[PDB]
Symmetry: D2
Subunit: 201 residues, 4 copies
Amino acid sequence: GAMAQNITARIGEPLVLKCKGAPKKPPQRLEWKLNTGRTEAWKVLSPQGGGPWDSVARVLPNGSLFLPAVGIQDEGIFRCQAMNRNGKETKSNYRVRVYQIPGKPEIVDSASELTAGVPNKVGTCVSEGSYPAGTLSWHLDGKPLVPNEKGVSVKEQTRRHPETGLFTLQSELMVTPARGGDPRPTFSCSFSPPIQPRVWE
Amino acid sequence: GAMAQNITARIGEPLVLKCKGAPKKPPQRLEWKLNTGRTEAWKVLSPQGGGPWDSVARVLPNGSLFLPAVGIQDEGIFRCQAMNRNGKETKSNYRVRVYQIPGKPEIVDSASELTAGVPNKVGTCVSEGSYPAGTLSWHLDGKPLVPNEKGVSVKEQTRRHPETGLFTLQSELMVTPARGGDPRPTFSCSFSPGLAPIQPRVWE
Amino acid sequence: GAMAQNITARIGEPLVLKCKGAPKKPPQRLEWKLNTGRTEAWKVLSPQGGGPWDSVARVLPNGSLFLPAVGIQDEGIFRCQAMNRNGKETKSNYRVRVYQIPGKPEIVDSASELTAGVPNKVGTCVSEGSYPAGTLSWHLDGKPLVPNEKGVSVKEQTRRHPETGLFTLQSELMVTPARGGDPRPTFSCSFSPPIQPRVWE
Amino acid sequence: GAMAQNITARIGEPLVLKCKGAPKKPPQRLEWKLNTGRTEAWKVLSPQGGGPWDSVARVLPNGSLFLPAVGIQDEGIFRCQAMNRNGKETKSNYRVRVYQIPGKPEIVDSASELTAGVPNKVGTCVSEGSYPAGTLSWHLDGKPLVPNEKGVSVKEQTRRHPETGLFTLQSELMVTPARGGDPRPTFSCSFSPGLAPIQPRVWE
Ligand SMILES: Oc1cccc(Oc2ccccc2)c1
Ligand SMILES: Oc1cccc(Oc2ccccc2)c1
Ligand SMILES: Oc1cccc(Oc2ccccc2)c1
Ligand SMILES: Oc1cccc(Oc2ccccc2)c1
Ligand SMILES: Oc1cccc(Oc2ccccc2)c1
Ligand SMILES: Oc1cccc(Oc2ccccc2)c1
Ligand SMILES: [Cl-]
Ligand SMILES: [Cl-]
Ligand SMILES: [Cl-]
Ligand SMILES: [Cl-]
């Protein structure tokens, strides 16, 4: 694409995109063009507005584009072309990416006892409501736990809410604890955009 | 994919998909799986139901899957696996495609005079509310008008409603009428799915 | 999108797109922009050319854009902006859709006998090498056979060639022949972008 | 989808996916299914093999699925279902994501003088050949530089190679240096995956 300013916009929150080089108030020779999940290629939006788009994105008196509540389908490219009073043309190019922050990750099915030297299901962690999906990771006593390295295995599941499109992640951790290891370890789960079992030697 | 029955479902209308080989009423060992625009890969739906999916797709007492009002995001694949009382397993595989019928095509601008032997903007036709987009075609006196053949030019535009996702099509027709041709032709516009005629005077 | 000329281009064949209003030979103030399966949003192509794109799409001496062999990934939007010697700017907007014609449909597993009043597997039809997929339909004595109407059922399968992306369609027809019907019917299969069994009364 | 093991596979490199619970050598009752950028929904692959898929993915004597050189189109879901000699069925579910590591980021244009208290183009950084695209970040004296915070502005561009599909990123950094700040700062550019520093003189 072209050189653009990258914008991250939280779903459900308003977004104001500035049309650089536009006169401060009408009359303004400016045009907004957008290509998002809502459009077939480019859609042109004007200061006059009108129609269904007025519910989604409106040009403000200062020529900025206003979205009252951003959604997943507003991901895409937004462009303004304006002429000032001198006659100089100025372009504004935005690449808009949307996100949502999930609830705190929760442990839903933890083991109270592990046996050293064999594989053990440690627990299951769930994170609800992210966008984009993100990932869950496990930690042992503050250090990251790396799957497929050192008797650690992890299985993961992603589901989508059928109306909001937000993701739920579920992650299952299995470990083979090392002989003569910590008898009261602490496992934790974190989301990237406290399980304390007894270990039996 | 696998061999499936193709289903075309009108947006906004209910859809019932049969689970073949399931007992006529509970208890039933059956499971529905769907992969649509609503899902991340396969989603499993059970006779027990529950949760947000109950607003979208529910298993009925006879084991059929019911969607009260189909939407664009319900396009995809739907599968049932059931065991009868004997123990025979039966699979049902559906490929669901959704559609919407637009309003009647309308001419929104039209020429009242054409000049033979030069290019003329004849008119503009608009169709609102289709899914998938579909296409607009022009006709001259009942015969199809073919772009790039015989001095015919067409330009077309597709727009999407920002909330419903339904398509609006706009088509502009230009023609170079042939000398000594019909002085009162009839141009019409028609819509063809994706799975007031114009009567100007021509000046020789 | 904008008002454009719709172009259908056969896969594997060249495509020439005219830049309207460009001078007949260099020097020309023109620019091509394309958004296809090959691009991240718009890509700009110039008369100077250069780089990997020279293998895919090149601006010709008359300012037209030339693709030596169109592929599936060249589906999208193509635009030219040119200035003539007077200084008038002219835009050319193309919407390019690609296709491939499959081989003739073939019957691969036909019944020689049907029994009236019960369901019968009549046969299987296969079409290889289309793009986009297209559909197969069945006909009885020249009239279309409509699934789910009048004891007709059809199952369909679509597969994609793992390297070319072209589609293979397979279609299975079952019918319940009507009592006192034609004892030597003719079923045929057609592709949209001769099975002659004996029927036992 | 279902619970799966997530696999990250480097483009161009082989990939072996194990079919858990299969007999160690033929005869084996096992079946692989994959849904990737190469397939229309599920494709079934068998120990017998054959056809164009033999160039892309093959079942090995131990029942593992082998891809000699992974590509972007092999992203997707891979599943094995096998029966052992007892008759126990075991499923293997893999979610495969592909990646490519770009070349080292390079500064392609850079300022040799900045003026404190006004905006300055500092430089342009380029990274070629990543998949997925990834992002470029700027740093000042080892600390991350945050766009829109403290007179910092960044513009970025992503392009795709027309044949390989790998991404090239270009990032332009502008800063307004603070009065009485460091007169010999060090700006650097770094690449972060998607799953020669600049040392100008500053004029107060
Ligand atoms: O002449 C006009 C009058 C009104 C609006 C307008 O929109 C643009 C402004 C600047 C650049 C491009 C387009 C141009
Ligand atoms: O034993 C059960 C219990 C509940 C549901 C179920 O659903 C299936 C039926 C047949 C095949 C696969 C799945 C099977
Ligand atoms: O309008 C709706 C909305 C959701 C589900 C629904 O389907 C049932 C209704 C009653 C009982 C059983 C199924 C109908
Ligand atoms: O001034 C120039 C010089 C060279 C090429 C050029 O490319 C365009 C031509 C017309 C319109 C827009 C862009 C513009
Ligand atoms: O009987 C067979 C013969 C060949 C392959 C096969 O593959 C599966 C094994 C277990 C479960 C599902 C499929 C099963
Ligand atoms: O380079 C390749 C290309 C295709 C398949 C392949 O995998 C096998 C090779 C030999 C024997 C068995 C499997 C290796
Ligand atoms: Cl899901
Ligand atoms: Cl649109
Ligand atoms: Cl396939
Ligand atoms: Cl690009």
